[PDB]
Amino acid sequence: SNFGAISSVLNDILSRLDPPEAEVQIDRLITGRLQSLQTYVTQQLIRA
């Protein structure tokens, strides 16, 4: 998932983009992919 970011793959956001782009883009990935863990983690804890 793109989490609104302009690509799925990090490299292709890395490569293509200027850091002041990449930064603001790479956040959306991170903040998304991060939050995906906390979901996945919590599910474990609750399940476990």
Binding site: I6, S15, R16, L17, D18
Partner: protein, 48 residues
């Protein structure tokens, strides 16, 4: 030939020219640098 062409068509026409089965460097486009605004959107013209 894309730049050094003679007349460029008016705006309500234009030519989408395939450049293919070939190698295209971008320095000679980029680093020639008489180009007023070379403004990339996704890519960073070094990365090309």
């Amino acid at each position: 030939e894309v730049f050094n062409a003679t007349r460029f068509a008016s705006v309500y026409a234009w030519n989408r020219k395939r450049i293919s089965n070939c190698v295209a460097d971008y320095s000679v486009l980029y680093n020639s640098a008489s180009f007023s605004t070379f403004k990339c959107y996704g890519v960073s013209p070094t990365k090309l």
